[PDB]
Write a protein that binds this ligand. Structure first.
Ligand SMILES: Nc1ncnc2c1ncn2[C@@H]1O[C@H](COP(=O)(O)OP(=O)(O)O)[C@@H](O)[C@H]1O
Ligand SMILES: Nc1ncnc2c1ncn2[C@@H]1O[C@H](COP(=O)(O)OP(=O)(O)O)[C@@H](O)[C@H]1O
Ligand SMILES: NC[C@@H](O)c1ccc(Br)cc1
Ligand code: NA
Ligand code: NA
Lengths: 444, 107, 117, 117
């Protein structure tokens, strides 16, 4: 009597951005035709908790017809994760804004001083005709950091286009980061370069237990319980684990091997047990054991009964993990033939993923990730940097980018010599000479 | 590796070798670990048994779980507190789902 | 239904499990039977608490099946749900036969060993 | 952007590694805290770890600061060359303190060894 269609053509599965811009979402061309949408059209997106966003839609020849690509800023504003479903509809009646009010998110502007409006907001909006909605949180990059703002009002309300004539007001009490859902300084899949296939495998492994945990009180099938990540130091194993927790909404508990082993006899075992209990209490959860081999070497390489007791404690806790619903243990080692083989038994670490060294294309992606908050001069050739860094891992490339930025600062701290000023930092360019200097040091 | 004093008369007096199964044994194991599943007509458990040389029961049980979870993932998209019996009972695991499981290299 | 065996299931159990189990199979059943039905990546258990005629009948196409009432408590009944047996073991018939022979008398006929040396 | 956190100085005994560390502290106006390897390892079980932790806290409280670990290999040999669980606990404590160093603003750790391998 009071119903309507259920398999609607404007329901799309949320997928990762290729265009990382806050204002853009991408559809396939057939889906745009089906919905009568055109490149550049403004669209209204509806997510969870009755959240909405306004974006510009573009076509993308790699997007599956049933999916929508959107960046992590839009996903948070819609309160969705990758794999959730949104609805989309045309939004033709968006007007140029007369005035908007925005406020910074407090933690994201700490240690900055100076005119944030001029430094961050003006370039972000300048002649871009961005659509925005009241309640939006958006991220702006520059000056070797990222800052966040909230749209607290628009005129007309509740959405408008920020046009050259739009007045932007920024006066008032900063927003408290704890009162809002946003991704500042949280790692996601957009922070990971050069291991697309390994990340796709891990995503599949955790999808059902972390995103659909109720499924496993319905069925007798067993999901993976433990995932071992293997690879040299600095290839992003911790990064991957953190990113999977954040992108799935799982609780994340880090166990660091040396930290456990720095404890007295008995305290190491209590701390391991406490970690598993806290994860279970907050499940769905990921426990990440960094430097697993510090805790669980092969019995050959143990020279003490306290060390053997600690390995045995970890084995017993993994065995209890089936009784702890929706808890996944990920662990990392760079000496896989070094860890105790009993860790690979059925029901312990049942899956293994090789996080290797990146290739040239992967190194370029990593370089792009670690320069996204920097101003790079026109002469910076990140492809050249990628080509000449054979054998380097992500940590090496991140260190290189920091080294180049600090060299740039040192060169322009001399001519200037309590709280640093945003306009100074945002106009400083890192040049190819700064990368060349970094690439020519031999002390790392 | 165990202490030989464990084999003395009156301790561990008998020993039994539980080896790796052969193709016929692997088929039986596959049948055991799919008995609660709906398998599509195209599922060829004999083919699965033939190509899993050297696998043990735990490997085959993991394979069957992996195939079932792949089937679910493929049909959680088109649906997305407590799961419903009619949904689960009409979902078929297909040969493509077993083929996907058999083609992963991360176990 | 036996309570523990339907936990985490929701929906029409009759239609999903009982109808296919009995459909045109003309199964004989007895009051007090516990039986197991498989599907949906699990196994569920039911108890026959009454039949008409009593105490056994054939479940035929015309038979009406009633399922209303308080679920049965798994602890009050003798059944094998989620208990491993020899039917859960594949591909080592000869080794299992050896082990069965080894334990038969001490585990099944323990009084024997106060009679013999 | 992240600055260097730890600087290892390698070279035979007597090449000025301690001298360099002291001179950098003096010329930059940084607080200087010396940790000597044998002195840490002369302490009882538990006191070695407390003294390492105390060193990092004092440096953080007076930052900008340089912590100099003289004869690092007395504290942190490879796991091959450790013949005790108290020695492994002490190395693990140093690793954990280095990891905490990002939370300790403007603290640089310099360390010296003549056996870098
Ligand atoms: N694939 C990657 N993409 C982007 N950054 C990476 C990648 N791998 C490593 N890094 C960078 O290297 C640093 C350390 O990575 P981490 O996850 O600690 O490595 P691991 O745990 O493998 O030792 C981080 O800053 C991280 O951003
Ligand atoms: N490069 C140098 N210039 C001047 N004196 C030096 C130099 N290297 C070592 N010395 C002298 O040798 C002595 C010990 O140096 P020290 O810094 O303790 O060496 P290390 O720490 O490498 O063992 C000091 O008196 C120091 O002045
Ligand atoms: N104090 C803020 C107030 O002047 C203001 C309200 C609403 C809008 Br839109 C802009 C500015
Ligand atoms: Na927040
Ligand atoms: Na029972």
């Amino acid at each position: 009597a009071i119903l309507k269609q259920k398999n609607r053509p404007n329901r799309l599965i949320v997928d990762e951005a290729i265009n990382e811009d806050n204002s853009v979402v991408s559809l396939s061309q057939p889906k745009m035709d089906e919905l009568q949408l055109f490149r550049g059209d403004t669209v209204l997106l509806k997510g969870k908790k009755r959240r909405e966003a306004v974006c510009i839609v573009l076509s993308d020849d790699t997007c599956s017809d049933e999916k929508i690509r959107m960046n992590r800023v839009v996903r948070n504003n819609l309160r969705v994760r990758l794999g959730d479903v949104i609805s989309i509809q045309p939004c033709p009646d968006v007007k140029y804004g007369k005035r908007i009010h925005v406020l910074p998110i407090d933690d994201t502007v700490e240690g900055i001083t100076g005119n944030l409006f001029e430094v961050y907001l003006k370039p972000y909006f300048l002649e871009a005709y961005r659509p925005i909605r009241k309640g939006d949180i958006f991220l702006v990059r520059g000056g070797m950091r990222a800052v966040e703002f909230k749209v607290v009002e628009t005129d007309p309300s509740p959405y408008c286009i920020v046009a050259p004539d739009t007045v932007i007001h920024c006066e008032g009490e900063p927003i408290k980061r704890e009162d809002e859902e946003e991704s500042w300084n949280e790692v996601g899949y957009d922070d990971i370069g050069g291991c697309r296939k390994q990340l796709a495998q891990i995503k599949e492994m955790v999808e059902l237990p972390l995103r659909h945990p109720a499924l496993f009180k319905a069925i007798g099938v067993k999901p993976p319980r433990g995932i071992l990540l293997y690879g040299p130091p600095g290839t992003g194993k911790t990064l991957i684990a953190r990113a999977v927790a954040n992108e799935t909404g799982a609780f994340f508990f880090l166990i660091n091997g040396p930290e456990i082993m720095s404890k007295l006899a008995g305290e190491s075992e209590s701390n391991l047990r406490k970690a598993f209990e806290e994860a279970e209490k907050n499940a769905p959860a990921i426990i990440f054991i960094d430097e697993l081999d510090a805790i669980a070497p092969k019995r050959e390489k143990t020279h003490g009964e306290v060390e053997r007791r600690i390995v045995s404690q970890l084995l017993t806790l993994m065995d209890g993990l089936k009784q702890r619903a929706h808890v996944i243990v990920m662990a990392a080692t760079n000496r896989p033939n070094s860890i105790d083989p009993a860790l690979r038994r059925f029901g312990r670490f049942d899956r293994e993923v090789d996080i290797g060294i990146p290739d040239a294309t992967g190194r370029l992606e990593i370089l792009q990730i670690h320069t996204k908050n920097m101003k790079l001069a026109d002469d910076v050739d990140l492809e050249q940097v990628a080509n000449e860094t054979h054998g380097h891992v992500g940590a090496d490339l991140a260190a290189l980018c920091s080294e180049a930025a600090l060299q740039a600062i040192r060169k322009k701290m001399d001519l200037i010599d309590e709280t640093i000023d945003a306009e100074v930092m945002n106009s400083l360019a890192v040049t190819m000479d700064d990368f060349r200097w970094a690439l020519s040091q031999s002390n790392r």
